[PDB]
Amino acid sequence: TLPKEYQDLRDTVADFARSVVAPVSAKHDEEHSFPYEVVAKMGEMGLFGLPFPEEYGGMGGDYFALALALEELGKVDQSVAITLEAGVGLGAMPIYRFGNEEQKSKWLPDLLAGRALAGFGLTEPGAGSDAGSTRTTARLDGGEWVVNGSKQFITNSGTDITSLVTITAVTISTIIVPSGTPGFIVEPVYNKVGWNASDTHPLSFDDARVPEENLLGIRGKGYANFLSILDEGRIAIAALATGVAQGCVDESVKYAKERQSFGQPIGSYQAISFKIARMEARAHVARTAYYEAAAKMLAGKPFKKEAAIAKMISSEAAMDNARDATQVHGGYGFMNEYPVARHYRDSKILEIGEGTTEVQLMLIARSLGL
Amino acid sequence: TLPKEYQDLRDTVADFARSVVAPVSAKHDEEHSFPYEVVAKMGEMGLFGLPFPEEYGGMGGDYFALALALEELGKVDQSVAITLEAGVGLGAMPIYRFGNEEQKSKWLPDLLAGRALAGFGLTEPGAGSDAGSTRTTARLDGGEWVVNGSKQFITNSGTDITSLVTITAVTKEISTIIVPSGTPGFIVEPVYNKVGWNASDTHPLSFDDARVPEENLLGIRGKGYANFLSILDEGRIAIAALATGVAQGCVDESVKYAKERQSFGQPIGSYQAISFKIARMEARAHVARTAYYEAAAKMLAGKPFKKEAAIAKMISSEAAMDNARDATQVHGGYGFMNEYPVARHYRDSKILEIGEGTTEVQLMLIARSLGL
Amino acid sequence: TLPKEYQDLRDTVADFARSVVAPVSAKHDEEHSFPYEVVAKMGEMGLFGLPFPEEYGGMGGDYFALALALEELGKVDQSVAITLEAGVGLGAMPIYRFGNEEQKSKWLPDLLAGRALAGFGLTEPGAGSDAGSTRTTARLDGGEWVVNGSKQFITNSGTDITSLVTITAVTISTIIVPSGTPGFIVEPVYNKVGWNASDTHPLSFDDARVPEENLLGIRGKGYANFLSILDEGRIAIAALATGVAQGCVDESVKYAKERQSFGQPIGSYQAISFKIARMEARAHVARTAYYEAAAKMLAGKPFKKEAAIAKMISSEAAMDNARDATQVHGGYGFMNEYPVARHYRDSKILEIGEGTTEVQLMLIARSLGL
Amino acid sequence: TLPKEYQDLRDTVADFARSVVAPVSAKHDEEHSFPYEVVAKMGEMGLFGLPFPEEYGGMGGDYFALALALEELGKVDQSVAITLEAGVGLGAMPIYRFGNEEQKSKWLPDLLAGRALAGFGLTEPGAGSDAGSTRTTARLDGGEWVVNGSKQFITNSGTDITSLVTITAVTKEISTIIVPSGTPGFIVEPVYNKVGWNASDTHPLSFDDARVPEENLLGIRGKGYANFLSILDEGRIAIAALATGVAQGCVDESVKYAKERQSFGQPIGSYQAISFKIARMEARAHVARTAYYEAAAKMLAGKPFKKEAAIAKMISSEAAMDNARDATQVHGGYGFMNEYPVARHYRDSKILEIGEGTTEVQLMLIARSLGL
Numbered sequence A, C: 001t002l003p004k005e006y007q008d009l010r011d012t013v014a015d016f017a018r019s020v021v022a023p024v025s026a027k028h029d030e031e032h033s034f035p036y037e038v039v040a041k042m043g044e045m046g047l048f049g050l051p052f053p054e055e056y057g058g059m060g061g062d063y064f065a066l067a068l069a070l071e072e073l074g075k076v077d078q079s080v081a082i083t084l085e086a087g088v089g090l091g092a093m094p095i096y097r098f099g100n101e102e103q104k105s106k107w108l109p110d111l112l113a114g115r116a117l118a119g120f121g122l123t124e125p126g127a128g129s130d131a132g133s134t135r136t137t138a139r140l141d142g143g144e145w146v147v148n149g150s151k152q153f154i155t156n157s158g159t160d161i162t163s164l165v166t167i168t169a170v171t172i173s174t175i176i177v178p179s180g181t182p183g184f185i186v187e188p189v190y191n192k193v194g195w196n197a198s199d200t201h202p203l204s205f206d207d208a209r210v211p212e213e214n215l216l217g218i219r220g221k222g223y224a225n226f227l228s229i230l231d232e233g234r235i236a237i238a239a240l241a242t243g244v245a246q247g248c249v250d251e252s253v254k255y256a257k258e259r260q261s262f263g264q265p266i267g268s269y270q271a272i273s274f275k276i277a278r279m280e281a282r283a284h285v286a287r288t289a290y291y292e293a294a295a296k297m298l299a300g301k302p303f304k305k306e307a308a309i310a311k312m313i314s315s316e317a318a319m320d321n322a323r324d325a326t327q328v329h330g331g332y333g334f335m336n337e338y339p340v341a342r343h344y345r346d347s348k349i350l351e352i353g354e355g356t357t358e359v360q361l362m363l364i365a366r367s368l369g370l
Numbered sequence B, D: 001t002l003p004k005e006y007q008d009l010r011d012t013v014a015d016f017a018r019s020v021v022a023p024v025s026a027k028h029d030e031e032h033s034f035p036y037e038v039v040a041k042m043g044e045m046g047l048f049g050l051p052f053p054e055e056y057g058g059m060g061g062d063y064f065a066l067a068l069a070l071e072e073l074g075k076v077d078q079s080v081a082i083t084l085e086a087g088v089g090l091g092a093m094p095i096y097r098f099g100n101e102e103q104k105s106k107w108l109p110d111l112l113a114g115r116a117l118a119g120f121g122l123t124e125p126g127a128g129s130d131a132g133s134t135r136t137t138a139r140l141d142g143g144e145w146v147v148n149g150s151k152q153f154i155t156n157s158g159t160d161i162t163s164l165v166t167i168t169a170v171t172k173e174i175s176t177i178i179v180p181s182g183t184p185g186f187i188v189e190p191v192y193n194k195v196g197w198n199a200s201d202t203h204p205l206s207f208d209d210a211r212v213p214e215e216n217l218l219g220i221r222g223k224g225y226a227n228f229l230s231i232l233d234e235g236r237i238a239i240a241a242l243a244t245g246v247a248q249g250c251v252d253e254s255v256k257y258a259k260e261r262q263s264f265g266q267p268i269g270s271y272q273a274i275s276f277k278i279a280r281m282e283a284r285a286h287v288a289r290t291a292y293y294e295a296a297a298k299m300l301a302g303k304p305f306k307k308e309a310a311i312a313k314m315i316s317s318e319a320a321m322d323n324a325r326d327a328t329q330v331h332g333g334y335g336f337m338n339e340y341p342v343a344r345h346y347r348d349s350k351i352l353e354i355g356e357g358t359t360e361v362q363l364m365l366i367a368r369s370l371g372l
């Protein structure tokens, strides 16, 4: 059973998700338009500050509290959930966990308050996201950094409220490039299978200059810093993917009670009711998986293995429940007007981002000695 | 081994698919634009007339030749493949199989030559596509049919070359009425925002007192739904072939991508996790292909092929869905980008489990064939 | 994280499982011989008394404590685990939860101490285990009950230490038939796919007489009593099935480090190491599933839905991990000498007993309104 | 449609399987007793001589005819089917394909007529079945080969009618030596306690200074493992057919059981959960059958069939495993009772994913065929 503080938050975000987020989800998906009005209301709720102390502007909660919110948002609109997830985990977290009093005090308050978004630029075109692959070069001249390179698939990097993008550059540490830096160009959005409302851009740097004080962490330790906070993001996206799986149940249950076939609701036929029952089982064990992962994290125990399992299994519950949810909806399962249709498109990236399934299996395998 | 005539057609459509269809596939998907220039090239190739006798403008072939062509188109662009499949199976076939000499001579030559497209309007909003569910009424007043109702998810019903849409209508007496496009009560509503098949033409249809000549009654008064039920199996074979091509296309792309893309100094195809996944993908497409070849073989021998087609369609559609999820995995982040074929195959393929009889409907048929 | 009391018990039974149970598992499986020496040592540990108060002879623990023990035993030998599971859940539990001070004081102390075993006879040949199907008739004459009928697949019903079999009989309540009752005949064991060492018998009753005081619960309420304690058994077998899944990982990990192919251990090839990594994920989420189920039960909250999901998912983790574990072992996967081979045979019944998968899906479906 | 000769054989073996093999299948499984009376009846039917020319005692048929027969035997009893499959593929075939005129005339007539059984001893304890792993040495001393080593999991190597066991031996020069049974150093160790195939004869073999004539060298000195690798594909087809029969047998049994067994007043086959599961089972067996038919068709046309056989074998073995797990589910508690065919199919089928090249080996082959 969930404690009051967490159960109260779950109820508030879920209420938010049904009353505020769901009515506009179809519009932003069709338009590919970033939901600024939803992000600002999430910011005023403090969701962007949940896993941060009131010191730097956060709400003094934890990552499990954020996880509960992401599950409730994931049920309804993945683009909104991933904007929150990526903002906290990829924008603010590298600055909060590796930035001095000045860096944290300059950038975090806006990020933590939902007034601004930050992104992390690691992936590059043609590069294998390894340490060996990073072809983006950075050179120090006096009190300013000079960056030359290109990044690919960077979330939250080109909104009207993006303040900075922390990037990786071979010198390899983490450098905070404010948006508006002359060499910093935000290329146009991608045409993606899904997450249509989520902001995603390629980035290019031609002799961009930023202050010396913008180095994130110690010179040479930025990639190591990233790996050390990856595990919280596996939990966060496991919760998002779990919400997706549950949203697919919820919609399919709703749809099965309305839609008729040969005089009875389609849920009266075992093939539909059993398929939905299995979907609810998948979502449930996905939820116990990431609760267990968060429990270890909050207790200070190791949670890398549990998070990797939680993320893989969750992502598979979302994909499987989306394919089943669209089957339950029939022709409507092929119409972007219906939530489960958008979930079918959106969920493919859940098996790929935050470490591919193959990466999670490698981690689990190494944990056994293989 | 495949006989010469069929291997020749397969090779020609494959060249067509790689040289003509693929280069423009990305533009049409992004734009949601109907590929008129591709449909015109398919029409001159004879593909819309492949299973129809020369008398009406056809090529004197069969549904297997059409299935071979659909597999090659499915590899590359599902919207183009389903435009052909629906044009033949739902546009020309109901007029060729149940229309009199006049109906056939007036409508088939343009359809069979690809100069026009035809649609079949059965599904309605709120209805379970049964005969008991058909709320679209058509009323005889003098010498004209007066139709009031609405159809949903009708393919090929609103292109610049759509000539007619045959609909099912209560007259529970259910007949089929040929509604030419341009009929005053006939409104083609705006396109749907669909998960996939972005380039394929799909519309809701509405009829507010549309009047058409009495000679437009297709088949016997009251037997139009029954006639539709009787010719369904060829389309199951046709779409199993399309889904088989999708499954194969996902393999082809993943193999090329796996040989180029690098990870830790070796192409990702050097790792068993990728190469075994692609090998399994290739196994799925192969047995899907043997399944629908057998269904067509029985059809061509004049033997029963309902059960074999139902299996071919189910297994094929699942090979497409599974191979699209694996192919996008192999492509990594690129698998989430509509510029890549496999990403479009992941979106497009979901309707393959739903149309031409849902998986649950195929399982029902197979079950009944066993005595269940 | 697990509290000390539970973690201590988990360590003791696991130690028991490796040192006492595993050395004799192959012998009893080959011989189809009931492991009396293992059952007596489990009894002296008090495992048969774990979910019962010290009052009636039990150890004053809970069903979760029993669940932890069953997982550790399930890892090694299903026949031993199911003997414990069925003894507690089907022998003692109907008497503990529905028997008067005298009935509990007469029978439970031996059951709870592992000195005796009791079974539950509900299934009948040709009957669908519904209330409508029970063709076994019972008639009251004076101070004795007279029973006529036949039962099928009754666990623990014909060992040298079986004291009684509580049965269902249409009159429909629960009647305690002591072993040795003249009309009570124990037919010979079945040749089963698996659980070779587990005791299983058809039962036949031709005018057997037992005292009036032997009525279990109220006349007419015995089947209702059974349904009301079914949910604890779903948790118990979910834990057993989870242990099986983990045992298959453990053995496959052990085997993958020893067995060579083309100069390297077979776990160096991704196809083997990834398959084992997935197996560990299945066992892990099965374990979070039934922990969650037990948590609700111990808190007094409803746990029927959670138990049904836990049992289904667990049983599927055992079957899937057994098929993968035998693949990892190659030809040895087809040899009853190896634990994972016995797990492949044994696990089929996990999808069937304690409510079939179809029954669990029906329950989950009804919980959603379908 | 199947040609007359093949349909005739299929019908005959099917009658055999239902009339002769099935009634005794339960007794042999419980007893672990080799079915000599079944093997003698198969021998007089010619099944062990089906793919061998008349000259050596065979029936002048092919491996497809044998595959058809194995599918019918697999439906009913896998131990009987694998006795035939291993007898032909591992006993007679290596002598027919690589032995001189004398070797063939001395050993093939009894094998091809079922009066004797032969085994192939390659696998050894601790070895990865590679040539580099073969630790069994055979030494030429005067005119006799002196063999020291051990073989593991050797089918048909210890029956009352086993005549010989061909083994692989280091001479890393690897040759094949024909060891007749009764040779002084040749010890047939006691049977294994196996998960399934309880009635099929399986033994570890040990050689402590066994001497056999020099004329027993099979093939060229040093080429015996290479020869074995070259004839593997026919056995993949043969066992895909066996696994296909297993898959079909599980359907057949589940259909009969589903029509009789009741639940809440209707047979369990009236519920979609059971009828759809059985319909899917039927789909799996059908596409498995189309897969291995295509592999055999290519083989018979003289075309490459390695890739097609590998797919047929993998997909077949998985159809058997999946259908056995579903069929035992349909049978409920009875699915856990060795008296029922599907329960025995659940135990027997696991080795179908492991023998005749593991699933991982088939995926490797398919992958290599794509350039991976």
Ligand SMILES: Cc1cc2c(cc1C)N(C[C@H](O)[C@H](O)[C@H](O)COP(=O)(O)OP(=O)(O)OC[C@H]1O[C@@H](n3cnc4c(N)ncnc43)[C@H](O)[C@@H]1O)c1[nH]c(=O)[nH]c(=O)c1N2
Residues within 6 Å of the ligand: A259, A260, A261, A262, A266, A269, A270, A271, A272, A327, A328, A329, A330, A331, A332, A334, B086, B090, B119, B120, B121, B122, B123, B124, B127, B128, B129, B152, B153, B154, B155, B194, B197, B202, B351, B354, B355, B356, B357, B358, B359, B360, B361, D272
């Ligand atoms: C883009 C596109 C294009 C087309 C079409 C759709 C789309 C999206 N269609 C319509 C399509 O054929 C139709 O939607 C499908 O047959 C599915 O029917 P329903 O949506 O009514 O599902 P329906 O409402 O029948 O069923 C929903 C779900 O319940 C299941 N189910 C239903 N009855 C059941 C039962 N008794 N037991 C168990 N499960 C059961 C189904 O299997 C499905 O999963 C169409 N139509 C047309 O008229 N002309 C056209 O040209 C096209 N083309």
Ligand SMILES: Cc1cc2c(cc1C)N(C[C@H](O)[C@H](O)[C@H](O)COP(=O)(O)OP(=O)(O)OC[C@H]1O[C@@H](n3cnc4c(N)ncnc43)[C@H](O)[C@@H]1O)c1[nH]c(=O)[nH]c(=O)c1N2
Residues within 6 Å of the ligand: A086, A090, A119, A120, A121, A122, A123, A127, A128, A129, A152, A153, A154, A155, A156, A192, A195, A200, A349, A352, A353, A354, A355, A356, A357, A358, A359, B261, B262, B263, B264, B268, B271, B273, B274, B329, B330, B331, B332, B333, B334, B336, C270
């Ligand atoms: C919408 C969206 C949003 C984001 C991102 C992507 C997208 C599409 N990303 C990028 C994302 O994290 C990245 O694409 C994934 O890590 C996958 O990397 P590749 O596409 O290079 O796959 P890659 O080339 O690594 O691999 C392709 C396939 O091969 C497999 N594979 C690779 N190596 C293997 C091996 N050794 N053994 C076995 N299998 C192996 C992988 O598992 C995968 O299935 C991102 N990035 C970023 O920097 N910042 C951001 O904010 C975001 N956000």
Ligand SMILES: Cc1cc2c(cc1C)N(C[C@H](O)[C@H](O)[C@H](O)COP(=O)(O)OP(=O)(O)OC[C@H]1O[C@@H](n3cnc4c(N)ncnc43)[C@H](O)[C@@H]1O)c1[nH]c(=O)[nH]c(=O)c1N2
Residues within 6 Å of the ligand: B272, C259, C260, C261, C262, C266, C269, C270, C271, C272, C327, C328, C329, C330, C331, C332, C334, D086, D090, D119, D120, D121, D122, D123, D124, D127, D128, D129, D152, D153, D154, D155, D194, D197, D202, D351, D354, D355, D356, D357, D358, D359, D360, D361
């Ligand atoms: C009852 C019975 C009957 C017979 C046989 C076995 C049994 C049990 N056999 C032996 C059988 O053919 C053999 O066991 C299998 O080929 C499997 O080989 P291993 O046990 O060595 O598996 P092995 O040790 O090769 O492999 C174990 C596991 O690792 C995997 N693996 C191996 N290498 C890998 C790689 N490089 N990459 C990825 N995965 C890899 C395999 O796929 C498998 O899952 C036999 N033998 C014989 O000589 N004569 C006979 O008549 C018979 N008949």
Ligand SMILES: Cc1cc2c(cc1C)N(C[C@H](O)[C@H](O)[C@H](O)COP(=O)(O)OP(=O)(O)OC[C@H]1O[C@@H](n3cnc4c(N)ncnc43)[C@H](O)[C@@H]1O)c1[nH]c(=O)[nH]c(=O)c1N2
Residues within 6 Å of the ligand: A270, C086, C090, C119, C120, C121, C122, C123, C127, C128, C129, C152, C153, C154, C155, C156, C192, C195, C200, C349, C352, C353, C354, C355, C356, C357, C358, C359, D261, D262, D263, D264, D268, D271, D273, D274, D329, D330, D331, D332, D333, D334, D336
């Ligand atoms: C070794 C062992 C040990 C035990 C037991 C069995 C075995 C083999 N059992 C019996 C066991 O609990 C029983 O066999 C199962 O409940 C399954 O019941 P049936 O075999 O009658 O299946 P049944 O006939 O109910 O069903 C067969 C199949 O159809 C499905 N099905 C049935 N009705 C359906 C419906 N309406 N909709 C959809 N699908 C449906 C089921 O899910 C199953 O897959 C037992 N019994 C006992 O009394 N005491 C004991 O101690 C034990 N222990």
